[PDB]
Amino acid sequence: PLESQYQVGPLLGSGGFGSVYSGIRVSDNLPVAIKHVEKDRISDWGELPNGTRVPMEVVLLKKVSSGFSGVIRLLDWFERPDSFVLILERPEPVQDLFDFITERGALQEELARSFFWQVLEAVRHCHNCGVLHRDIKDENILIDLNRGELKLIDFGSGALLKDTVYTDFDGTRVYSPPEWIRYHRYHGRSAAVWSLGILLYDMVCGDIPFEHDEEIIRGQVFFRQRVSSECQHLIRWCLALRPSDRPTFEEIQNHPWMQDVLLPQETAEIHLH
Numbered sequence: 001p002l003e004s005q006y007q008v009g010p011l012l013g014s015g016g017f018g019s020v021y022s023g024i025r026v027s028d029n030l031p032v033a034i035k036h037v038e039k040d041r042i043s044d045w046g047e048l049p050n051g052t053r054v055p056m057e058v059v060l061l062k063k064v065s066s067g068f069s070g071v072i073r074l075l076d077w078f079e080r081p082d083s084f085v086l087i088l089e090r091p092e093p094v095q096d097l098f099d100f101i102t103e104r105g106a107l108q109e110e111l112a113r114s115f116f117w118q119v120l121e122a123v124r125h126c127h128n129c130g131v132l133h134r135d136i137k138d139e140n141i142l143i144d145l146n147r148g149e150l151k152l153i154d155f156g157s158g159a160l161l162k163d164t165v166y167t168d169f170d171g172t173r174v175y176s177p178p179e180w181i182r183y184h185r186y187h188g189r190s191a192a193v194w195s196l197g198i199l200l201y202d203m204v205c206g207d208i209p210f211e212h213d214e215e216i217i218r219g220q221v222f223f224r225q226r227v228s229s230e231c232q233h234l235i236r237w238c239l240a241l242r243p244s245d246r247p248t249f250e251e252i253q254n255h256p257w258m259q260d261v262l263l264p265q266e267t268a269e270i271h272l273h
């Protein structure tokens, strides 16, 4: 009985991911998000440890959902005749990174450093749990405005982490690496790093660097806003045309621009409150 266990609120959004409603856990008034996904619209199917056919996101969220708060938590899930229903964490107040950047324009590098660091930690946590997100972008990052903490959402395009090639991609085109565009194949970590490069650019420039496939393939980064030489270098490094020329997570976090990051709470008090 999910209809009586959660008090359904307003529809927050809908699209290829399905339909996401605002919710309240009747048990303790905990703010939740209720996600509906039709079985026909499900591309990747997964298997629970107890052996049960289920949406891949459920499998992935289970592997990542622990104490760490850089990833959104799967609280529960139900199966309906023609759909699955996911119950998720909901911060409040909240705003995603896309709306935040849209509203504020390009971010100050101190703020972008904090946000980007937190994303890196979240992505690093996912890969540790054997999970690849495959659609890292502002729109899939929630900001806990009160705590200054960022959270990864939407693992519906994700996959089990592996060391061999991926030949399928269902993330956003303009966030996809040139090797996907050219060869329809990529590797997990190097492709994630590319999208992280796209993400960082968007934070400090207020917009995406590449619009068309030809721009992605060319890999020429033009900066439309004032950005420090350190940050430009890190961005151009993440956006190296050859995957093996891109930095590891460790190299990104050891980068000179990545130093002296603010704490999430400091971030909130300075940039959010």
Ligand SMILES: Cc1n[nH]c2ccc(-c3cncc(OC[C@@H](N)Cc4c[nH]c5ccccc45)c3)cc12
Pocket: 012, 013, 014, 015, 017, 020, 032, 033, 035, 072, 088, 089, 090, 091, 139, 140, 142, 153, 154, 155
């Ligand atoms: C608002 C919220 N709180 N917790 C969660 C968890 C998961 C989602 C979520 C799940 N699946 C897909 C999602 O899509 C995010 C974007 N790709 C699309 C989007 C843009 N604006 C909204 C508003 C509400 C839902 C989705 C989107 C998010 C949202 C929330």
